[PDB]
Design a protein around this ligand. Sequence first.
Ligand SMILES: Nc1nc2c(ncn2[C@@H]2O[C@H](COP(=O)(O)OP(=O)(O)O)[C@@H](O)[C@H]2O)c(=O)[nH]1
Ligand SMILES: [Mn+2]
Ligand SMILES: [Mn+2]
Ligand code: NA
Length: 604
Amino acid sequence: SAKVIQGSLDSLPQEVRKFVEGNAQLCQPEYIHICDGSEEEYGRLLAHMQEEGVIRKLKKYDNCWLALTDPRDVARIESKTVIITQEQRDTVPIPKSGQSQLGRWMSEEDFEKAFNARFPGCMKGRTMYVIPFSMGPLGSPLAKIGIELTDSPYVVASMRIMTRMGTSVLEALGDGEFIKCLHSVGCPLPLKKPLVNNWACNPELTLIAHLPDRREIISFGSGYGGNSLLGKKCFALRIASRLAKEEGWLAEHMLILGITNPEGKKKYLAAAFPSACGKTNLAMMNPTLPGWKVECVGDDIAWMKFDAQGNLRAINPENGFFGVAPGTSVKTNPNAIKTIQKNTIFTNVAETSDGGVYWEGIDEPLAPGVTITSWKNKEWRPQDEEPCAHPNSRFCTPASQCPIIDPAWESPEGVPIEGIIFGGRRPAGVPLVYEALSWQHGVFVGAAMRSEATKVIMHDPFAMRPFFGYNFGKYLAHWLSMAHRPAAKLPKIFHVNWFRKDKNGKFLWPGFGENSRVLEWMFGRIEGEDSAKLTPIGYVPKEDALNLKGLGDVNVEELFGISKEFWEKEVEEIDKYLEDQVNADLPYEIERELRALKQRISQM
Ligand SMILES: Nc1nc2c(ncn2[C@@H]2O[C@H](COP(=O)(O)OP(=O)(O)O)[C@@H](O)[C@H]2O)c(=O)[nH]1
Ligand SMILES: [Mn+2]
Ligand SMILES: [Mn+2]
Ligand code: NA
């Protein structure tokens, strides 16, 4: 109580009080700031970080900010990310011959050692911020509350954008369940190691842990993104996927968009692509086809549940976009360009001398006079060796500012999903687009997903490889079980490939807003249109079914080319992968789909 500098311990729901005070006794913060989520709290905290050189203000824009990190702490790190369960098998399938790549289990005993070696006294001299936050619209029956303790002001500010945060959240929680989220940069005062670029972090000791059985996320040593903004990956994919398994719903690495045709008919679609494969870009697409409209519900994470009527309802549980900045240009994503010019926090991009932002791929000239400070706080010119922005640099921006944010983006009941799309980067062999033969086939298609690393072609089932909160075999069984709900309206499932390249490494499909031509065919297919031709991998568009006018040289034969040699190779790789990685936990229906694809290919 003596150390509370905002709010009141007496005021917290009892269980929230125990969490705060228990971890205060452990971490030894100098003060405790219970966040209220107010504009005043936000602005004062921003100005404070500014005074201290933790952030700089971008004067070219309205209320925007730039943080530059320790180059040791620049990304979410999978090698340091663990899930603790009594049994390894509940976390990952026990692989047949190899090491698992579907999760990273740590015993409770090992974790307890790691914890006791990190957290005691870790917030000495620092403020513990208490962040009460809702993943999902505040009223929604699909929403879940978390409380994050952190000693990073950069985390509080970013969480205000990426979640719904504040007092109204505590008042909505009452004596209900919440996910316990503990974070420390791991740099108690006085500092024992030198502070780099005013960015507190402890790389040697970084550890991002999930303890689903205790409803706890415990993360240490990193101030960055997914390691520190605990609502996003840790809560909304890892903890949630398991919660969803227990509760009958789904927590997925999916964008949600609403699409409207020239008649005004509207549908919602969800899509799972791995990072750097274009979700944010699709979710706020500027469609090239006249009359068509795409509206954004979320760009990263979907929580979905069948309602009493059998509609699959999806909410975006985030309150903002945490997008990769480099590659973002008016040509590629004009709506992201529009959103990020106010109330936005940037991380590890270059700064122009007039107080604007810059990054590789921004594809927009600088005025004669304007110079560039790189993300490493050094002067920079287009012919230095280093990129001006870090490749994983970011904007953190309010969802409500996207000029095409969907009008139901915050509806507490969610939006009805009629189609689910899978995809990644495949330079060869995979057509632009196909549609699954059935639900069980579609689940197989999700399971089989592969994507060029950003020359290796990696497996990334459902775009969830880094995020499974529990056994992936069980997660497949959970997806298959959806067909066994009597009322369920199972959405059509599609697979796309924006990235097939021709013989000289050039893209066959222009992509971007031209992807609206692919969405149109999907939409028509959901309505039951006779626009599909059967192939060994599923339905592809008929000849002339796609609107290809205005395109120029589009080699359709090569684009939808299905080679026997490639697909024989593809099934072997899928076969081996599923055998090793899922092994005893592979559902029968999946093996059956694998057998069936092998057989259809063998008849070519
Ligand atoms: N060639 C091509 N590139 C794309 C397309 N969509 C997105 N990209 C690029 O893919 C990279 C990642 O895009 P992004 O929206 O950040 O993907 P996310 O990480 O999944 O949200 C960016 O450089 C984009 O310019 C597309 O349709 N075609
Ligand atoms: Mn994205
Ligand atoms: Mn993501
Ligand atoms: Na800094």
